[PDB]
Amino acid sequence: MKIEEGKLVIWINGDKGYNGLAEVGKKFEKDTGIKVTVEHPDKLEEKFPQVAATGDGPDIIFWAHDRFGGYAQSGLLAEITPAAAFQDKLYPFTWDAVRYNGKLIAYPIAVEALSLIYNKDLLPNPPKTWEEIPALDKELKAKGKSALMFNLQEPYFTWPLIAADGGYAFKYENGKYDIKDVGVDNAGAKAGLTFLVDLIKNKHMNADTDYSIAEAAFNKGETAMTINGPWAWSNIDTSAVNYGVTVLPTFKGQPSKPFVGVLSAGINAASPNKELAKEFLENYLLTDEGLEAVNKDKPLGAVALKSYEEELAKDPRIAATMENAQKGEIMPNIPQMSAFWYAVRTAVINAASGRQTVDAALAAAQTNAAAEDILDELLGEER
Amino acid sequence: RPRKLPQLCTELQTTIHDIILECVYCKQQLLRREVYDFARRDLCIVYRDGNPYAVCDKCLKFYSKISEYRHYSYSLYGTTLEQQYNKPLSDLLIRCINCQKPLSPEEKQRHLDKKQRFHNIRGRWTGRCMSCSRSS
Ligand SMILES: OC[C@H]1O[C@H](O[C@H]2[C@H](O)[C@@H](O)[C@@H](O[C@H]3[C@H](O)[C@@H](O)[C@@H](O[C@H]4[C@H](O)[C@@H](O)[C@@H](O[C@H]5[C@H](O)[C@@H](O)[C@@H](O)O[C@@H]5CO)O[C@@H]4CO)O[C@@H]3CO)O[C@@H]2CO)[C@H](O)[C@@H](O)[C@@H]1O
Ligand SMILES: [Zn+2]
Numbered sequence A: 001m002k003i004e005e006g007k008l009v010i011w012i013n014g015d016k017g018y019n020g021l022a023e024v025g026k027k028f029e030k031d032t033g034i035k036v037t038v039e040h041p042d043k044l045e046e047k048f049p050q051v052a053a054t055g056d057g058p059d060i061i062f063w064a065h066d067r068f069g070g071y072a073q074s075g076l077l078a079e080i081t082p083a084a085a086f087q088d089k090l091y092p093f094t095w096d097a098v099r100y101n102g103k104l105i106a107y108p109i110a111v112e113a114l115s116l117i118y119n120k121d122l123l124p125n126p127p128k129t130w131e132e133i134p135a136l137d138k139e140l141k142a143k144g145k146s147a148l149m150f151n152l153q154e155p156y157f158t159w160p161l162i163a164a165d166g167g168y169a170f171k172y173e174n175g176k177y178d179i180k181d182v183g184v185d186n187a188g189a190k191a192g193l194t195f196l197v198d199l200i201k202n203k204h205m206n207a208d209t210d211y212s213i214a215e216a217a218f219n220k221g222e223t224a225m226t227i228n229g230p231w232a233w234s235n236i237d238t239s240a241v242n243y244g245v246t247v248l249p250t251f252k253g254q255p256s257k258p259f260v261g262v263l264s265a266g267i268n269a270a271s272p273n274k275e276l277a278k279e280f281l282e283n284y285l286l287t288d289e290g291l292e293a294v295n296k297d298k299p300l301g302a303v304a305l306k307s308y309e310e311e312l313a314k315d316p317r318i319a320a321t322m323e324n325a326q327k328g329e330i331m332p333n334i335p336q337m338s339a340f341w342y343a344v345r346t347a348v349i350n351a352a353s354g355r356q357t358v359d360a361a362l363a364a365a366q367t368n369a370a371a372e373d374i375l376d377e378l379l380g381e382e383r
Numbered sequence B: 001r002p003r004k005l006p007q008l009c010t011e012l013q014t015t016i017h018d019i020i021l022e023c024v025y026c027k028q029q030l031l032r033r034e035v036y037d038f039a040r041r042d043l044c045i046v047y048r049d050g051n052p053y054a055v056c057d058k059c060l061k062f063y064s065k066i067s068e069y070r071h072y073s074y075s076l077y078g079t080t081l082e083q084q085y086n087k088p089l090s091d092l093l094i095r096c097i098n099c100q101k102p103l104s105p106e107e108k109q110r111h112l113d114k115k116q117r118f119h120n121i122r123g124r125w126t127g128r129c130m131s132c133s134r135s136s
């Protein structure tokens, strides 16, 4: 049906603290009378452009900022105009993640980066280098365990290694992305993905390992290390594993370079509730009390709100999160990012499974990541 | 870097009859027919890693259909296009949606008369040429 006037419907991904967010929604309803419904649909980031293009969907969509430029280019997001006083409550670099063509298109919530999570009982001294892992795995397999398991189905998790020695998505210069300069099939990207494929070939990882398999193995104490973000920590807590969160291993002496996401809340351009959505987001969610309610459910990472982040920063897990973030790069928010991710997803899976060589997989992905833009050049108006 | 096939030929010291071109997407060699069709449709040479590429028919049709289905948008009558760019229709690049050939001045003036709109796809304006409007 059409978006309902006089309430708020929120979409947020199923790995985030949606029950905590619903608690913020209950506070809003208690104070204002406005009911807040929080949902976590499958593939919400693909559903949103479909249903919002017909004028339907949630009032507010949560996702990392990398999806939002495509939404805004399609006219699906309302322009955000907080007062200067509210803008100063959040870190400047998080506003930049949600700025598209000079306009704010979402509220930033929290900064996410992958870290190395390790079992302190199994592995008191986690490795500093990727190159140590195979020998470390041989050692741990003799103890009935293994060194490392992480999600190999989503390119988010393998990108830090691909980027370490030179891979990049779109070249960034003068505050701008050149979609003609894609770095998916260069020598550094090939080196990183080849190292990952060799780990699988040498029986240190399995190509089929996904989020659920890796999470279960680490939280059952079967593997010494995983790679994951802050949303995963509270399940590890309840599994009673004694864990640490630390800097990602280096590859060829270079830091792993995670793509940093800013969890962001956009307002549907079709919402008849834009004023209420702004009141909820600015004055209920983006407060100490509101972010704490979400954080208590699933940890947000380093939040955009300065007053609360200065408390979270004292947590060594948050310090490690931001150390890894600072070595990585903030994701572009340009419309081309989804094509980039779909392209690299196929490349990593095809290479990991041996269906394609590393070179053929990444050569295909380099093309797919820019297919639309290549078509624009072919059909454009030149000489 | 030459953007059009004749200049690329006048720069590798060859002709359109002889030039060997690969598709930007699949890297397969173009058939000679595809080379001629590339030039007649006034397509643009694209450079990747400093090398020139054209496009084969299969990939051009494949990614064209994607771009149409996945970047649907709006339509305008020619007079509005004229107002919007200030130039006459004959001065604007408008391609056939089906064969990608630039519309002729006659085909564009025909669109105007029949009160037919042009269609926007990812910032590209399209119509339908007379040849693709007369086929089994
Ligand atoms: O349909 C067959 C196919 O379905 C399943 O995979 C598909 C996904 O279900 C679907 O969501 C879609 O995923 C795309 C996604 O739409 C696209 O936006 C891009 O995703 C990026 C994120 O945008 C980016 O923010 C980041 O996501 C992080 C997130 O920041 C973080 O907070 C946390 O939630 O972890 C996320 C990573 O998991 O990274 C991802 C990229 O990894 O790219 C996605 C594709 O990789 O499309 C999938 C493929 O269709 C099944 O799993 C699959 O096996 C089936 O073949
Ligand atoms: Zn081709």
Ligand SMILES: [Zn+2]
Residues within 6 Å of the ligand: B096, B097, B098, B099, B100, B101, B128, B129, B130, B131, B132, B133
């Ligand atoms: Zn035609």
